[model samples]
Structures are given as structure tokens and as C-alpha cells.
Target: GPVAGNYVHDFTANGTSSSFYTIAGNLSTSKGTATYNGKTLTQCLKMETATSISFTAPSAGKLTLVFAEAAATAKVDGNKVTASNGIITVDLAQGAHTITKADACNLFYMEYAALEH
Candidate 1:
């Protein structure tokens, strides 16, 4: 079991671009849901093979999708983005977005929250 403090925020969207876990430090499995900003957002995403996780941005801003796992690769809106230790920062438009994960191992935990500029 991981600690609560071990959980972390993703990144802050500067303007047109986004960065992940740049502020400081940096969840998991099965198809489930979690709460954020008084809203239920998709969470607890897990996969054995490569797959994509999609979610809607509440507003136009920056979002840091933190991948607190061992090894994995991510893509934003079908575009390749760099991630470190499973963390991926994305500058997403206000609406629909997709995060694709590939080459993941067992127990991949992920969580994300909104970042203010």
C-alpha cells in the first residue's frame, strides 16, 4: 500500500503548452472512478496490453497525467509525448482528449488533476 503523500499532482499548463510533475513529486488498476473538484472523473485505469485512456477536460487549461508506475509510455491525442517514470504532462484543449499507454507492466497506477496557470 502506498502512502497518501506519495500521491502527487501532475503539471501546470503554462499557456499553449503543458508540463508534467515539473512542480515536484508524484495510483492504479481496474476500470473505476474517482472524485476531483466535486466531480467524478475517470480513474483507476489499468491494462495488461497497450491501451488508451480518454477523458474530458473541465475547462481549457493544462493537465498533468501522473503515471506513478514502473515503466510505461504515453501519448496525447494520438501524438507522442515524453514521460518519465510513467508521468506525462499534456496541454489539452477544453473538451475531449486521449492518453494512450503502451508497454506497461503489472500494477500501473495513475491519477491526474487540474493545474492552474
Candidate 2:
């Protein structure tokens, strides 16, 4: 489904549709492989260039991303950070946020915490 309103949605999954999340900028649904949660995934996201990922949180939650390479770095809401593994999780508040990447990162999916959706 198109990302609208204040609801938590899964960006991508195994053998699933690609039009799940609504993101702007240099974000691509990369057709590749990834290892997340002891599982292998082919479809993921790649930051071909510097980009900003858009998402909203109905309340306090955790942002999770599964990647193949851990050399991922970005600034969430203006704060800088770097990923050490394919499994990345960032805490978010009740509002809107941005994932501004300054480097390359292969992200498989984003389905943040508090599965109240």
C-alpha cells in the first residue's frame, strides 16, 4: 500500500511487492541479496546517491533496517550515525523523520517497532 496517514508499514519483504513504502529522493528498490535475521533476501534498497528517506511515527517506536553490507552511514533527523552491521535499528519519536544518507547502504526493509499496525 502507498505510505500515507500515520501508520507503520513494512517497506519490503521476501517475495513481496516493491511499492510498499513511500520515499523521496535517491532511494532505489535495489534488486540484490541480503542476510537479515538469519535469513536470505534478494530484494532490498540501495542509496545510489545521497538521499533522504521519509517516514512518520504514530508514537514512539524503533526503526529497523536489514542490510547486506554494514558500511552504512546516515543522519537521522540531523544526527549523524554509522551502521556496524546489516541489522540497524534507530529509535524514533512520535512525528516525522528523515534518513539522510551520505554514503552507500543496502537496506532490505523497514518495519519499525510497536507492531500496532
Candidate 3:
């Protein structure tokens, strides 16, 4: 599911290159029609086993990760967090954070909602 925020990423060509998130460790993407969380999307970043995705939160807020539950396991900020369903959400500590995948999987998108109050 898409998070209500200012930094929603769809993993599109433009989104992949966004300044908000950086993909590292030899990662690619999957293109085709796929249904997840009752929604069909055309592309999803294919996470390599050694992939590392990083982002920075301008302020403390909610972070949302969308990936294939059947095939994704990533560590958030050095803590293990698996994609048990189609989406995973975490409260971030207003700083830089990294997600490292342990298996090859599809990542639909990630979003960050900064709290101004």
C-alpha cells in the first residue's frame, strides 16, 4: 500500500533515480504486470541478495516498504525485518537509514512521511 506522504516512490524510471532513496549493491528491476496488495503495478525493483537501499528522513516519521511477502527479507537500520505481507511500516528516527536485503525479491516502492509537528 502507498503511504500518505511527500516521499512516495513507485520505482518508476524517474523514481529509481530519486534523491530520496539510493540503490546500491548491483540491483536491477522487474518489469511486467504484477498484483500486490490488490493493486497492479508495472515495475518493481528486483532486490539482489546483497542489495542495499538507503534513505534519509528529514524528520521523524513513518516509513513504508512495499515488497513481495513471499520473497523478501531485509534488515532495516541493522535490524532484521521481513516482508511478511505486501507492506511493512516502521517509525524512523529522523536520520539516515539503510535496508539490506538477504534474498532476491521484488520491491514495489518505499515512502517516508515526515512529521512537521
lDDT (C-alpha, whole model) for all candidates: 0.43, 0.59, 0.69
Query: Model 1, poorest ten-residue lDDT window?
Result: 9-18
TM-score of every candidate: 0.44, 0.67, 0.75
Candidate 3, superposed: residue stretches over 4 Å from native: 1-5, 13-15, 25-39
Clashing pairs in 3: none
The top-ranked prediction according to lDDT is: 3
Per-residue lDDT of 12 in model 2: 51
- Model 3: per-residue Cα lDDT over 7-104, one tens digit each: 87776444467778887644234444445556666667776666778888887888778775544566788787666566667888878999876565
Number of backbone-clashing residue pairs for each candidate, in the order shown:
4, 0, 0
For model 2, the superposed segments whose C-alpha errors exceed 4 Å read 1-20, 25-32, 115-117
Model 1 has an lDDT value of 0.43
- As a TM-score, model 1 comes out at 0.44
- The TM-score ranking, best first, is 3, 2, 1
